[PDB]
Amino acid sequence: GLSDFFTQLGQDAQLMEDYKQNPEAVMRAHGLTDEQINAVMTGDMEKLKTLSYLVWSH
Amino acid sequence: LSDFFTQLGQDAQLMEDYKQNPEAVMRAHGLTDEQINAVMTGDMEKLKT
Amino acid sequence: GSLVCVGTGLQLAGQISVLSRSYIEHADIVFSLLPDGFSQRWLTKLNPNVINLQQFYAQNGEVKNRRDTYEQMVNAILDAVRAGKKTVCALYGHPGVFACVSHMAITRAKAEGFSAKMEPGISAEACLWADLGIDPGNSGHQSFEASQFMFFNHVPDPTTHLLLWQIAIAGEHTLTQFHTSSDRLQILVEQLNQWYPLDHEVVIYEAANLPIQAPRIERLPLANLPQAHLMPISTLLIPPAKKLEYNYAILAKLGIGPEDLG
Amino acid sequence: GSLVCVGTGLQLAGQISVLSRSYIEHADIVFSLLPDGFSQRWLTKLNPNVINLQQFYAQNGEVKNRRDTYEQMVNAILDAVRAGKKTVCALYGHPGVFACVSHMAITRAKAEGFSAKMEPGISAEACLWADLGIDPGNSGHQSFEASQFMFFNHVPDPTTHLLLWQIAIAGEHTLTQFHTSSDRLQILVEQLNQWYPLDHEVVIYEAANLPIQAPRIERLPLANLPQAHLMPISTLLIPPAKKLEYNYAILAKLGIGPEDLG
Ligand SMILES: Nc1ncnc2c1ncn2[C@@H]1O[C@H](CSCC[C@H](N)C(=O)O)[C@@H](O)[C@H]1O
Numbered sequence: 016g017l018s019d020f021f022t023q024l025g026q027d028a029q030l031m032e033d034y035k036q037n038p039e040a041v042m043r044a045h046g047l048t049d050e051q052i053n054a055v056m057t058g059d060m061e062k063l064k065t066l067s068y069l070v071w072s073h
Numbered sequence: 074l075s076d077f078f079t080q081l082g083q084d085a086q087l088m089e090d091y092k093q094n095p096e097a098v099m100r101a102h103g104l105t106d107e108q109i110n111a112v113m114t115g116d117m118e119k120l121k122t
Numbered sequence: 123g124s125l126v127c128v129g130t131g132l133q134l135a136g137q138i139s140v141l142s143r144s145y146i147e148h149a150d151i152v153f154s155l156l157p158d159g160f161s162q163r164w165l166t167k168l169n170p171n172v173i174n175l176q177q178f179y180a181q182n183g184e185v186k187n188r189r190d191t192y193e194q195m196v197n198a199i200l201d202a203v204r205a206g207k208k209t210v211c212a213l214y215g216h217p218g219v220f221a222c223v224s225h226m227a228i229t230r231a232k233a234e235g236f237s238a239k240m241e242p243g244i245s246a247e248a249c250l251w252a253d254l255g256i257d258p259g260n261s262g263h264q265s266f267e268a269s270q271f272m273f274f275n276h277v278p279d280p281t282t283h284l285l286l287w288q289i290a291i292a293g294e295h296t297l298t299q300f301h302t303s304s305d306r307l308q309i310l311v312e313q314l315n316q317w318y319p320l321d322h323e324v325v326i327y328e329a330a331n332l333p334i335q336a337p338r339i340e341r342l343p344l345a346n347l348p349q350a351h352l353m354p355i356s357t358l359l360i361p362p363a364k365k366l367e368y369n370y371a372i373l374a375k376l377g378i379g380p381e382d383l384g
Numbered sequence: 385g386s387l388v389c390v391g392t393g394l395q396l397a398g399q400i401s402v403l404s405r406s407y408i409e410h411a412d413i414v415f416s417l418l419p420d421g422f423s424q425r426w427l428t429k430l431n432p433n434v435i436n437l438q439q440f441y442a443q444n445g446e447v448k449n450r451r452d453t454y455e456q457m458v459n460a461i462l463d464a465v466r467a468g469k470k471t472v473c474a475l476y477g478h479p480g481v482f483a484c485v486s487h488m489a490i491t492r493a494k495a496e497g498f499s500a501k502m503e504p505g506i507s508a509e510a511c512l513w514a515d516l517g518i519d520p521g522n523s524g525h526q527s528f529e530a531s532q533f534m535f536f537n538h539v540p541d542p543t544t545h546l547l548l549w550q551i552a553i554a555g556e557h558t559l560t561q562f563h564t565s566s567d568r569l570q571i572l573v574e575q576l577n578q579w580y581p582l583d584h585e586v587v588i589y590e591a592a593n594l595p596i597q598a599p600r601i602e603r604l605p606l607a608n609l610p611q612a613h614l615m616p617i618s619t620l621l622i623p624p625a626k627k628l629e630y631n632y633a634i635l636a637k638l639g640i641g642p643e644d645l646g
C-alpha cells in the first residue's frame with residue numbers, strides 16, 4: 016500500500032503536482048493511515064520504513 | 074532516421090541488438106547506405122543535414 | 123502558474139530521468155534548449171507546445187552579450203509562469219550545471235510568489251566519469267570555467283582530476299564570440315604550466331549526443347592544446363600531475379601512520 | 385555474458401534514466417545496492433532476478449575491511465558475467481561516482497574479454513546543486529572524500545564550493561567502522577581552519593530518498609560540526625570563504641582588465 020504509492024508518486028509528475036497541492040488529501044485518497052500520514056508530516060523516515068558507503072581514500 | 078535514434082536511445086534491447094550488429098540493425102530500420110556510411114565514419118554533420 | 127526546470131541529459135531521449143520526462147509530458151508549455159534537432163523532434167513528440175530558447179541567442183553575425191541573451195530567456199520563461207501556465211524548462215544535461223538561465227528563472231519566480239523548483243539531470247561531468255572510467259573520488263575532483271580560471275585567482279590541487287568547462291571560449295571576455303583564439307589558449311598553457319609540465323597528457327572530452335555516436339576522448343600533451351580543434355561542447359580534462367602523498371601532519375594528530383591505514 | 389553498470393539516482397523510482405531502467409528491465413540478473421526497502425521493492429518489481437549486494441557488508445557487528453566487501457561484490461557480479469548472463473549492476477545515484485565497485489567490475493570484465501560499460505546516473509552532487517540552488521560554475525567546485533582529505537595532501541581553493549563526501553567516517557582509518565568520533569571531526573575542523581574560520585557557515589546536506597521527504601540542509605558554524613548529527617548519506621558543503629582576487633597577471637597578457645570584462 017505505502018510502497019506502491021511512493022513508487023508511483025516518484026515517477027508520476029501529475030501525481031507529484033497533485034501531492035504538492037494537497038498532501039493529506041492525496042495521501043488519504045491512496046489509503047495511507049493516520050500514523051503513516053503523521054510520520055510523513057513530521058519527516059520521521061525511521062517510522063515510515065517500519066510501517067551506503069562504496070569507496071575510501073585510496 | 075530521427076525515429077530510429079529515439080527508439081535506440083530509449084530501448085536497451087534495441088541498443089544491445091545494435092551493438093551486436095550495427096549495420097544489420099540499421100538496414101532493418103531502412104537506413105540508407107550513405108546514412109549508414111555517415112554513422113560508421115562518425116560524421117554527425119552529414120547526418121544532421 | 124508554476125516553474126519546473128529539468129535536464130534532458132546529453133544522449134537523445136534515453137538519458138532523461140523518468141520523473142523529468144513525465145514533467146515535460148504534463149507541462150502546459152515547454153521552453154527547450156537542446157543540443158540538436160533530433161532531441162528537439164523527440165521533445166515535440168513528447169509535448170508539442172514548445173518555445174525554443176535558441177532564438178534568443180545572437181543571430182546573423184550579430185554582436186550580443188550572452189548576458190542579454192539569458193535575460194530574454196529568463197523573461198520569456200517568466201512570462202508563461204505569470205500567465206498561470208504550468209511551465210517547464212527543458213535544458214540539456216543538468217538544468218543547474220553551468221546553466222544560469224534556470225537558476226535566474228527559479229529565483230525570479232520564487233520572489234514573485236510562484237512555485238519554482240529544479241530537478242537534477244545527467245551532466246557532461248557525469249558522462250565524463252563513465253566514458254573515461256574515472257571516479258572523481260579516486261584522487262578528488264575540481265571543476266572551473268576555463269575563462270573564470272583565467273580571469274581570477276584559482277589554485278588547483280594537482281593530485282586531483284581537473285576540469286575546465288567551456289574551454290573553447292577560454293579567454294573570450296566580451297561574451298559575443300562563439301570561440302577563442304590560439305593565442306588565448308597558449309596563455310592558458312603557460313598559466314597551467316605553474317602546476318603541469320608542457321608534456322602533460324590532457325584529454326579533450328565530448329559526450330556523445332546520439333546513440334550511434336562514440337564520444338570524443340582525445341589525448342594530447344598540454345603544449346598542443348592551442349592547435350586543437352575545440353567545439354562549444356568540449357570539456358578539458360587534466361589528470362593528476364602528482365600522486366597522493368601522505369599527510370604526516372594530520373596522521374600524527376590522529377595518532378597514526380601510513381602503515382595503520384586499512 | 386556482458387556487464388552494464390547503471391545508477392538509480394537518489395529519489396525512489398523517478399530519478400533513474402529511461403535507458404537505464406530499460407537495462408534493468410531486460411537484464412538476465414541484477415546486482416543491487418540501493419538506499420532502502422522501498423527502492424528495493426521497486427527494483428524487484430522491475431526485474432525479479434535480483435541479488436542484493438548489501439549482504440556483503442559486515443553483518444552483526446563483525447570487523448571487516450570494506451576493501452573485502454567491495455572485492456566480494458565485484459566477484460559476485462563477474463561470476464554472473466562469466467556464466468554467460470547479461471548482467472546489470474544497479475547502484476544508487478551515479479554508479480561510478482565515489483563508488484569503486486562498478487569501476488572494478490568493468491575493468492576486470494574487459495580484461496577477461498567481456499563487454500562492459502557504465503551508464504551515467506544522477507548523483508548526490510547533482511542533487512545538491514539543485515536543492516541549494518547553486519550553479520557549480522558560479523565560482524567553481526571541488527570534491528574530496530573526507531578521509532582522503534585528512535590522510536593525504538590536499539589544498540582546497542577557498543573561492544569555490546567545497547564538498548567533503550563520507551563526512552560521517554572522516555578520519556576512520558580502519559575502514560571497519562560505520563562512523564567516526566567527534567575528536568576526529570575536531571581534528572578536521574582544526575585542519576580546515578588553515579583556510580576557513582571557525583564561525584564559517586557550513587552546510588550538512590542530505591538528498592531525500594523518498595518523494596514525500598524534504599532534503600536535509602542544516603547550516604551551522606564550522607566549529608560546531610563535531611557535535612553535529614551525521615549519517616552515512618551525509619555530505620558536507622563548505623561554501624567559499626574568500627573573495628576572488630583578479631589575475632592581473634593574465635588579464636595583462638590578454639591585454640585587458642576588469643572594466644573590459646563583459
Ligand atoms: N556533450 C558534451 N560533452 C562534453 N562537455 C560538454 C558537453 N556539452 C556541454 N559540455 C560542457 O559544458 C559547457 C557548457 S555549460 C552547460 C553544461 C550542461 N548544463 C551539462 O549538463 O553539462 C561546454 O562548454 C562544455 O565544457
Ligand SMILES: Nc1ncnc2c1ncn2[C@@H]1O[C@H](CSCC[C@H](N)C(=O)O)[C@@H](O)[C@H]1O
Pocket residue numbers: 067068069070394475476477478479480481482483506507508509548549550551552589590591592593616617618619620
Ligand atoms: N542522499 C544523499 N545526500 C547527500 N549525500 C549523499 C547522499 N547519498 C550519498 N551521499 C554521499 O555519497 C557518499 C556515499 S558514496 C555513493 C555516492 C553515489 N553513488 C552518488 O552518485 O552520489 C555519502 O557518504 C555522501 O557523501
Ligand SMILES: [Zn+2]
Pocket residue numbers: 247258263265509525527
Ligand atoms: Zn563534480
